[PDB]
Design a protein around this nucleic acid. Structure first.
Length: 94
RNA sequence: AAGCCCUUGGAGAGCCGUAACGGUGAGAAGAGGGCGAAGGUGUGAUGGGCCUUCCGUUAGGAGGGUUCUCCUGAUCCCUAGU
């Protein structure tokens, strides 16, 4: 799993921050979004509600923003991740 | 004027910011805004109030000015944090 992700950060385009991806996702212009378990529940439904409006695959992450951000490498946590380019990884099928 | 909210915005190997604690990807910075204390300023107030000149000196009568620039300052308030 992590190897697949580590490839995306290497070259594939990524989006960090809910506001941008949530702005973007409603327009149906994202390859995929992965969310850690630590998302505030007020937004989780909206993602799930907006998930079916253009059928964008979503992976649920059991982790928090930290390990997601630790894998992301940013010192601070990331609640969600936005993708507009899979690049060369093999994640989208998930 | 703080605080708290609205868009935009997009930043970390660091940035924002405090008297202090802190805030920051859950959107910081910066731009625009909104709700919005105390107070303050106009008006009320060509009326009185304050001092004062003089003549009248019973009875009263007639004028003058009442500005400007600055400072500290409450245990008297509201406003915030912690």
């Amino acid at each position: 799993f992590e190897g697949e992700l580590k490839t995306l950060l290497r070259s594939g385009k990524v989006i960090l921050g809910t506001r941008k991806t949530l702005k973007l996702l409603k327009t149906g212009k994202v390859k995929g979004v992965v969310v850690s378990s630590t998302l505030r529940q007020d937004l989780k439904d909206d993602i799930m509600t907006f998930s079916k409006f253009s059928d964008i695959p979503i992976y649920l992450y059991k982790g928090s923003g930290y390990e997601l951000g630790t894998l992301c490498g940013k010192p601070f946590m990331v609640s969600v991740i936005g993708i507009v380019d899979e690049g060369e990884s093999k994640i989208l099928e998930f």
